[model samples]
Target: ALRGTVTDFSGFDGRADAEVLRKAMKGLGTDEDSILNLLTARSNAQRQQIAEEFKTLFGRDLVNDMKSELKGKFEKLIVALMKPSRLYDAYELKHALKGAGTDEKVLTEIIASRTPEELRAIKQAYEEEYGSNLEDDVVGDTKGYYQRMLVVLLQANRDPDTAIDDAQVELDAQALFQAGELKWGTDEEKFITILGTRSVSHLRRVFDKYMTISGFQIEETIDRETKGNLENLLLAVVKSIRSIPAYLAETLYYAMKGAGTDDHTLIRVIVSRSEIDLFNIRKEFRKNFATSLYSMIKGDTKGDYKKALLLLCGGEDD
Candidate 1:
């Protein structure tokens, strides 16, 4: 059930796309439409091919050319799309770690939502690109149980077993309850171990049983018990456990709402999920927000940046 919006463009020619991009950027004024239009439709795999041919054809770098020609948010959007998927995530993870202070939201959103394999790939690419272990960076930047949980995730060792044990689910629910709700002090280690490593099916049942035993939704307890990066990460894991699409939709909602947009969050959510589940994200957006994701972006942004994102968004859900 691949729910992403973008599809591989039929009749795709790497060299032809390369030439078209070169021509679009050849003259005095850059054709932003041509650049955005071509880049947005093709999958990142196709984009890499075009990048290669763009280099082979003119002995010039496609990414550098776009960087020179484009500016502002639109420039950022175009450049973000240029990297391969795994490497794109690695770059963003590096950005989160290396950026001024720590962008904890970026850390939580990306680190929480990815599959084990993708996280592992990003770890390798992180070292490849930045010459540092991803784990060391996370451990260096963050602290406490949050750091411990992130270390667990970086190992990419989440249980792959699909068989949900009702008995164990009950015990796990009780463990979580005793660890958090029924204790003098919350045991973050227990919460992190169970929530961070369990199979999705198992955790869904664990959450349900937890509600039955604790008289509170697991989210309620997490909200009451935790705060800051740990809170955000735990809640993200819970939301992601329930529905990744819904989690991402809520993310997009907050990103665009309020007085000013969290542009980096907005960009990362749209760019990262556009190919994975933006269609479902848009559906969740409309269902939860009572407005189309398309409309929000349409009203919230302008010019070439909007056009580029809208194209990746595929179409209006409403």
Candidate 2:
């Protein structure tokens, strides 16, 4: 996931970075160029180290000083860049679940996209930061099949081995067909068990076999049988398994489309994927939408927010 746009800086100097940040914020006017060049150029680890050195060199927290000096989306971007990845993920999850109506899209994308190990770390970070059980919050906030699928994923103990069994894949495909296409009512538990437990590589084979047997994509089956959050959640799992970059690219498009921007979604995807798979997502976005993500972002947003998004996207319009 660290295969991303942000690269390690070869001549990284933490003290020098900290001093630049301090000087930028200390004067009459903020040095936005210096701040952006220093913060966006380094990897997250190096940014963290600079934060520590900033605190040691000056008696104030780096983030606090920046917040006082900066405003609007630029400030938000800088603050987001300062967070440790897992902690930021936890923050996003809690934020999704906290509001009046839950943002199940955010929940689905985060939980579905992570590996078992990554999810485990995120769950730990959530509990440590928020003083609540991540599973309990998910279960309480969601309902029906949506709740059940989230509970299974929140466990973060999915089988990770890629060793494939051809026969088992066929059997699973047949079971899925029976559970949905050939039956009067869908046995969602079967779908959940098979989808939740199988290794990603094994599941890809199962998905291929399923298409041959049922003459319908598994996503089509889920879409036809389930409604609302359940359908979205299942599709998220399938999409994540099949092509995570494609899934995220679709997410970014949704975020930027419609009435107004879903700023939280836009920010989380760019900031999170900037250090992970934003490059692939950029290609996927263009392949799917016939326009570059950079162009879409430039069209949809303005000011510092637009600039920050373009920087994280790692390219100009094609």
The best candidate in terms of lDDT: 1
Cα error, residue 183 of model 2, in Å, equals 2.2
lDDT of each residue in 42-88, candidate 1, tens digit only: 99889999999998889999999999999999999988888788788
Per-candidate clashes come to 0, 0
Return the TM-score for candidate 1, rounded to 2 decimals: 0.96
Error of 1 at 139 (Å): 0.5
List per-candidate RMSD values in Å: 1.3, 1.9
CA lDDT of each candidate? 0.88, 0.86
Where model 1 places Cα greater than 4 Å from the true spot, the runs are none
lDDT of 2 by residue, 1-318 (tens): 435788789999999989888888886988887888778889889989999999888878998888898888778888888899779889989988894788898899899988788889999999999999899888878889888998888787777766788999999999999999898988999998888888889999999999998999999999888788888889999999998889988999998878778777888888887888888888888998888989888888777667767776766642
